[PDB]
Write a protein that binds this ligand. Structure first.
Ligand code: CTP
Ligand code: D4M
Ligand code: MG
Ligand code: ZN
Lengths: 1362, 49
DNA sequence: CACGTATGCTATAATGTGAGTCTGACGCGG
DNA sequence: TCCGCGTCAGACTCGTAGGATTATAGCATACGTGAG
């Protein structure tokens, strides 16, 4: 059996006959009385096989003795009943029947082949109209439809010498007559003469179809069915329910439809029936076959008994529910159990409580086995009865089997790989599974009733993979970020916090002890507190240059508590680690530090110790949550009445006339958002400290030990955001739309909402809950699309030996460095010997793993930019090199060859989305956004650096910016970049370029609400094309009468004004046009949708003035609901409505033609003589002016860039970095750390394919799309040998199409669009050699990755010989 | 003078299940929802207290 | 020969049909 | 380029319920196989 590949191709009528073991003539299923199969019926034993093992139907031959003995009397073979699941039958169709999949499935093959529209073919098939098959007399040519009356005309006049027919016989004849060769040549000759742009594609696609049809050896006639195969009985079973009733598959109802109508057609042909009736029967026959193959595609699906449509053949393959997703890409499993989970704080990290009765059952065969080796059980059935009786000796044997045997625990949903972990089980009395606290993080396990699956790895290999690869202890770091996932929380945190944190004097302030042992004895004796300052002599052990540890003894001020924790702390670590008050954030760093200095076993022991001491001291303390804990600020009512009269004054100013709905919405939201922060900060000052404790004499201030404050500050549970809603003000709540309610909740939970505040709360709450149910779906759909695209990607090579990589700079956005360069290049293979400023001695080598030590050196030298080797730029064909990838972030060392990198990448991008959906939503009610993006104030002194900026000086004296992309930076002394600040358009700068500012100076102010249109030139203002009612609208006031103009866009606009662009035009006193300094452009500013101009036409402007205020409603809430669609849009490469224009080819440019205002930018390069001419919208304004030598991909327009255009002009590292940064913007906004290298994996999978120009020595020619690896392989052998060189161009594929473009059709089918995938593969005669993971999982084989990579590479070399 | 009508009870906004939650006023609406939902899952004990 | 299963014929005239609707999104083809 | 068409939409858990619905004519000869 063991095979190499799988191929799919069209079934010949005669091929179908081969599989068949007889023609089922009758609809008869079984006999009502003897429930046995009827003669030549659907369950016929004569065709499909015997009902019972080695027994004929009439019962003449029984027992295994009779083998293949076909009983002469009944005609039934004596073999196993298993055969009835494998043997097929067939049906002789009277009329040829078209196969719906090749007809209806778009584009369609029968239509594309005949170059004949679907409508025409259908009219032929339902017998509405005749089609001409061939007429020697050009009178009527080919494929020309004739109605009933049209057929009578030619029939008298010409007749005979012209052949026209109706129904599937006609189409089959048309397919049989068509010559694939000759049409191929005719179509090639058409493309040579006149290749029109869009029809060149369609002609090339029919050429590819014709070529592929001939190469496949498929015949077009076979698209029409003459013989119809029948599925084996056991795969469409009729079984008796207990109730005496029977139950059957719907395929039986569909087969019986087809047979009844087919046999009736045979009858009506024998009887010579009139043709109208024959036709009706042929229609009904095609309807029945089309229902049987794919029901619902041919229009209204055939409803059975309930009304539900009958499940057809295609329906069992197709859906998610089909057979791929349900029974083949995942299954139900033996040696599997589940139960409620509960804590096991006593456990060590590598252990789990497994109920006695559960484990008894899971290890049943292992018990049977030891029982017989001890000779306690005579045989298996006696062993079973000993277990059933649950005898005392059995428990002792079961204890012996479970020893050192790992068990897999799984929790739904399995978002990332740590959702499965292995543990050594501990037999426990009781029905609940006991889970170790520290792994609860990876499972997202909380014990309010969650359940877990248990699975037993059976083989020695599976046991070893569980103990080595999947063990809890061995999976400490996450696959996404390098941060550890296993870490103490809740009690373990509360206890260590209570121990470390200091109090004033207390019992035994300023005492001297001799090590931590004296401190502990003092605390246990009850003469010292855990939070009391005491001088102690701790002896810390610091690592030297070698492996030897140096010992150092010194006196350091500390609490008793921290000294006692030092006892748990392993030698090697500094005492400064325990000397702070410890929270969860500090303890995670503690365990990471210990792991990287000392190693795995010490951190394992240290982790357990931390857990034990934490819980033991957690119960020793006694923290409680009283109602008095949440102390309300005294000054809430003041802040609120102030805020409330303020918002009231703006609502009264709304009826007056300075306010749109959007402007006032922004202003009220800003007022309440600042009020909420104020009351929160009042509560947190009043709560965080406001501890008056009398120190040894007088009063002091110190931190409050208020319970809720300790919980928040420790990071144990609630955040400041939750405690705002408890003790402060609940805040502005956000509707399900994401738009925020104008009335905030003034009250908090301690205060009691009132009926109205509670009702208003409900909106936000329920939208949160609905969000977790619904959005986890699109999140999860993104995980699955990602996984399918990056399944094949595996570490194949150790070092490809590439120099190429992408320049990584430090993410320094928004003053405070967001992400340091060190962390960004922590664990990557350095590329290009990058030394220190003075180029005269190499500092860092080439191919070297960037370890924390190398990274610390980098920081002393302050390197900003580093070319590092990346997955995208790796040369490895059919996978990636360990060096291009770098460290396995989960392991903390260089990635292992054979590791499935793609899967980890998809999982790690997918998980946060899916987790942040449910997580922020059930947990929060309101929205705590802060929009006050008015003024940039600079934190540290320095000089203003403005890169990319074009601003005009206004009559105020001030620099008013008119660039779109503006980056203000803060340079120090030495000349490094430290703070950044995105200045917007319409900004007033305090100081201009390269000027000194002091700490805490404002350097630029701008309005956040309203992006103004700011004019460069000075003069008078003219209204072009601004016809009232057509393009704008007029709105008038009282007493004098102030009119205001609002620019209605094409949305509200009449048909009359559609073609008019409305714009404020600058003319001078004469009423001539003022030019824009130094260009031939006349000033004219094109007003978009709802641009609210106050000042009516003819008003003298100065330069740098605000013409028009376009309203900028930011109704966005800060959640993943709005971020994820942006993430999906980048990964799927969704071009925007207004793509950004960029230099196509280098060279010198002048303007040519204009369509009214639409620019036709003409590039005429220097060396390359051919021009490149672009149509451009009138209102889109250019960054470039005229004759400049601009290179490939210089930014011309304002607007978002298409990743396609970036790849196509700048190239790989450009587009990869664009995706990485634009995606990471979203995830970083939600506090999610994913390493760039994961995103880079998936971008590599996006850039899989490439289009080719010209020919080589293979079959390329114009514009075939082939994978990049395969064309590089060709190019390597071509360059050595010569032959025709082939120009190539990489193509970007967005995820869905990239996964369907894979040359494995088993992966394409399993993903999506299964019907279409299998028709295109069947017609091409495609052969899948099973290289990917999904393919091998489907056939139930060893994965070509991880453990399987060894075995799989051994098979590939067995292909070379034997 | 503008007032035409008034709410009959303070309870009329809430359903039966939620009306049984004592200090509902001090409870987040999400948690209160699951509370009213879990009261329905409560199995009666041997001694009804 | 009985039992199970099937094909046969009936003569007033009658001769033209007949569920649930509403998701929102995106990507090709006519 | 506008608009009908058709392919998409998270992972496990358990507890379930109903067989409900429907009408057909009655009797003699013929066709075919099984029991005594
Ligand atoms: N419909 C759901 C409900 C829950 N979960 C998973 O189960 C976790 C825990 O659910 P739950 O216990 O309800 O939420 P917690 O955040 O633990 O809050 P609490 O138990 O305090 O209500 C969710 O975050 C999520 O990963 C899920 O996948 N789908
Ligand atoms: C309701 C629900 C729950 N769960 C998991 C999450 C926590 C446990 C207990 O859920 P309950 O307490 O709703 O099951 C889910 O995974 N999906 C769900 O729809
Ligand atoms: Mg839970
Ligand atoms: Zn037999």
């Amino acid at each position: 059996e063991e095979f190499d590949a799988i191929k799919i191709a069209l079934a010949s009528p005669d091929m179908i006959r081969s599989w068949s073991f007889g023609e089922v003539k009758k609809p008869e299923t079984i006999n009502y009385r003897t429930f046995k199969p009827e003669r030549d019926g659907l369950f016929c034993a004569r065709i499909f096989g015997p009902v019972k093992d080695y027994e004929c139907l009439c019962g003449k031959y029984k027992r295994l003795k009779h083998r293949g003995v076909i009983c002469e009397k009944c005609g039934v073979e004596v073999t196993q009943t298993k055969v009835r699941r494998e043997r097929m039958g067939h049906i002789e169709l009277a009329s040829p029947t078209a196969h719906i999949w090749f007809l209806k499935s778009l584009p369609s093959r029968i239509g594309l082949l005949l170059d004949m529209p679907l409508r025409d073919i259908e009219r032929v098939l339902y017998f509405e109209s005749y089609v001409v098959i061939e007429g020697g007399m050009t009178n009527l040519e080919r494929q020309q439809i004739l109605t009933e009356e049209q057929y009578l005309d030619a029939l008298e006049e010409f007749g005979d010498e012209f052949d026209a027919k109706m129904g599937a016989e006609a189409i089959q004849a048309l397919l049989k007559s068509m010559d694939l060769e000759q049409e191929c040549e005719q179509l090639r000759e058409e493309l040579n003469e006149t290749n029109s742009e869009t029809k060149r594609k369609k002609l090339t696609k029919r050429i590819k179809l014709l070529e592929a049809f001939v190469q496949s050896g498929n015949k077009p006639e076979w698209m029409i069915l003459t013989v119809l195969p029948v599925l084996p009985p056991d795969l469409r079973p009729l079984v008796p329910l207990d109730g005496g009733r029977f139950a059957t598959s719907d395929l039986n109802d569909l087969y019986r439809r087809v047979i009844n109508r087919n046999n009736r057609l045979k009858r009506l042909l024998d009887l010579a029936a009139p043709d109208i009736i024959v036709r009706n029967e042929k229609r009904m026959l095609q309807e029945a076959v089309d229902a049987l193959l794919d029901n619902g595609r041919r229009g209204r699906a055939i409803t059975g008994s309930n009304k539900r449509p009958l499940k057809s053949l295609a329906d069992m393959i197709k859906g998610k529910q089909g057979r791929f997703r349900q029974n083949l890409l995942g299954k139900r499993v033996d040696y599997s159990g589940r139960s409620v989970i509960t804590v096991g704080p006593y456990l060590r990290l590598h252990q789990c409580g497994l109920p006695k009765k559960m484990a008894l059952e899971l290890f049943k065969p292992f018990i049977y086995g030891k029982l017989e080796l001890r000779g306690l059980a005579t045989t298996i059935k006696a062993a079973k009865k000993m277990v059933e009786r649950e005898e005392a000796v059995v428990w002792d044997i079961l204890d012996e089997v479970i020893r050192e045997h790992p068990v897999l625990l799984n929790r739904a949903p399995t978002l990332h790989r740590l959702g499965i972990q292995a543990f050594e089980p501990v037999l426990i009395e009781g029905k609940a599974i006991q889970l170790h606290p520290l792994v609860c993080a990876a499972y997202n396990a909380d014990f309010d009733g969650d359940q877990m699956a248990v699975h037993v790895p059976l083989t020695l290999e599976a046991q070893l993979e569980a103990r080595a690869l999947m063990m809890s202890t061995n999976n400490i770091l996450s696959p996404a970020n390098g941060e550890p996932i296993i870490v103490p929380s809740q009690d373990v945190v509360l206890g260590l916090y209570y121990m470390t944190r200091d109090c004033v004097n207390a019992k035994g302030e300023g005492m001297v002890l001799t090590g931590p042992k004296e401190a502990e004895r003092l605390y246990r004796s009850g003469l010292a507190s855990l939070h009391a300052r005491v001088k102690v002599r701790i002896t810390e052990y610091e690592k030297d240059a070698n492996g030897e540890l140096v010992a150092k003894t010194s006196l350091k001020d500390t609490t008793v508590g921290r000294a006692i924790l030092w006892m748990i702390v392993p030698k090697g670590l500094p005492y400064s680690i325990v000397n702070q008050a410890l929270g969860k954030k500090a303890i995670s760093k503690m365990l990471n530090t210990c792991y990287r200095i000392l190693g795995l076993k010490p951190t394992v022991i240290f982790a357990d110790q931390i857990m034990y001491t934490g819980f033991a001291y957690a119960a020793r303390s006694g923290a409680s949550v009283g109602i008095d804990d949440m102390v309300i600020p005294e000054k809430k009512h003041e802040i609120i009445s102030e805020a409330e009269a303020e918002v009231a004054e703006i609502q009264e100013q709304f009826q007056s006339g300075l306010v749109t709905a959007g402007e006032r919405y922004n202003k009220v939201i800003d007022i309440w958002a600042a009020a909420n922060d104020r009351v929160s900060k009042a509560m947190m000052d009043n709560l965080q400290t406001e501890t008056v404790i009398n120190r040894d004499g007088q009063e002091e201030k110190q931190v409050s030990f208020n319970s809720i404050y300790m919980m928040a500050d420790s990071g144990a549970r609630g955040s400041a955001a939750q405690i705002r809603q408890l003790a402060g003000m609940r805040g502005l709540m956000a509707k399900p739309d994401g738009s925020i309610i104008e009335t905030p909740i003034t009250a908090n939970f301690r205060e009691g909402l009132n009926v109205l505040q509670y009702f208003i709360s409900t909106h936000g709450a329920r939208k949160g809950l609905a969000d977790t149910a619904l959005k986890t779906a699109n999140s999860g759909y993104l995980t699955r699309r990602l996984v399918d695209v990056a399944q094949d990607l595996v570490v194949t090579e150790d070092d490809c030996g590439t120099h190429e990589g992408i320049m990584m700079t430090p993410v320094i956005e928004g003053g405070d460095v967001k992400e340091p360069l060190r962390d960004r290049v922590l664990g990557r293979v350095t590329a290009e010997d990058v030394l220190k400023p003075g180029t005269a001695d190499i500092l860092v080598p080439r191919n070297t793993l960037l370890h924390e030590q190398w990274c610390d050196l980098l920081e002393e030298n302050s390197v900003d930019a580093v070319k590092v080797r990346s997955v995208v730029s790796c040369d490895t064909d059919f996978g990636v090199c360990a060096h291009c990838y770098g460290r396995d972030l989960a392991r903390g060392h260089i990635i292992n060859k054979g590791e499935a990198i793609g899967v980890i990448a998809a999982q790690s991008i997918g998980e946060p989305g899916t987790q942040l959906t449910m997580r922020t939503f059930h947990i929060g009610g309101a929205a705590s956004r802060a929009a006050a993006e008015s003024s940039i104030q600079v934190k540290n002194k320095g000089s203003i650096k403005l890169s990319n900026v074009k601003s005009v000086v206004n009559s105020s004296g001030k620099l008013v910016i008119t660039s779109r992309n503006t980056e203000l930076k803060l340079i120090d002394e030495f000349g490094r970049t430290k703070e950044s600040y995105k200045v917007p358009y319409g900004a007033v700068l305090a100081k201009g370029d390269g000027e000194q500012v002091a700490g805490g100076e404002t350097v630029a102010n701008w309005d956040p609400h309203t992006m103004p249109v700011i004019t460069e030139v000075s003069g008078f203002v003219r209204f072009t094309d601004m016809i009232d009612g057509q393009t704008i609208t007029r709105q008038t006031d009282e007493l004098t009468g102030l009119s205001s103009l609002v620019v209605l866009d094409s949305a509200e606009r009449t048909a009359g004004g559609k073609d008019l662009r409305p714009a404020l035009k600058i003319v001078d006193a004469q009423g001539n046009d003022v030019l824009i300094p130094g260009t031939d452009m006349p000033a004219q500013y094109f007003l978009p949708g709802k641009a609210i101009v106050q000042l009516e036409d003819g008003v003298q402007i100065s330069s740098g003035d605000t013409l028009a205020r376009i309203p900028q409603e930011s109704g966005g809430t800060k959640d993943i609901t709005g971020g994820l669609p942006r993430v999906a849009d980048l990964f799927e490469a969704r071009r925007p409505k207004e793509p950004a224009i960029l230099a196509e080819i280098s060279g010198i440019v002048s303007f040519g033609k204009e369509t009214k205002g639409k620019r036709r930018l003409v590039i005429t390069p220097v060396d390359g003589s051919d021009p490149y001419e672009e149509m451009i919208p009138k209102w889109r304004q250019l960054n470039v002016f005229e004759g400049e030598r601009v290179e490939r991909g210089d930014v011309i327009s304002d607007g978002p860039e298409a990743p396609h255009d970036i790849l196509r002009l700048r190239g790989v590292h450009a587009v990869t970095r664009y995706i990485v940064n634009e995606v990471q913007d979203v995830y970083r906004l939600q506090g999610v750390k994913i390493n760039d290298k994961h995103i880079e994996v998936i971008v590599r999978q996006m850039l899989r394919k490439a289009t080719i120009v010209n020919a080589g020595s293979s079959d390329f020619l114009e514009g075939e799309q082939v994978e990049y690896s395969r064309v590089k392989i060709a190019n390597r052998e071509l360059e050595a040998n010569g032959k025709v060189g082939a120009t190539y161009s990489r193509d970007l594929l967005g995820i869905t199409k990239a996964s369907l473009a894979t040359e494995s059709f088993i992966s394409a089918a399993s993903f999506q669009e299964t019907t279409r995938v299998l028709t295109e593969a069947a017609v091409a005669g495609k052969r899948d050699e099973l290289r990917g993971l999904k393919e091998n999982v489907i056939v139930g084989r060893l994965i070509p990755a991880g453990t399987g990579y060894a075995y799989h590479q051994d098979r590939m070399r067995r292909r070379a010989a034997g | 003078d503008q007032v035409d009508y008034m709410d009959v009870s303070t309870q009329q906004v809430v359903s039966v299940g939620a009306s049984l939650i004592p200090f509902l006023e001090h409870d987040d609406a999400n948690r209160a929802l699951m509370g009213a939902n879990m009261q329905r899952q409560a199995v009666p004990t041997l001694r009804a207290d």
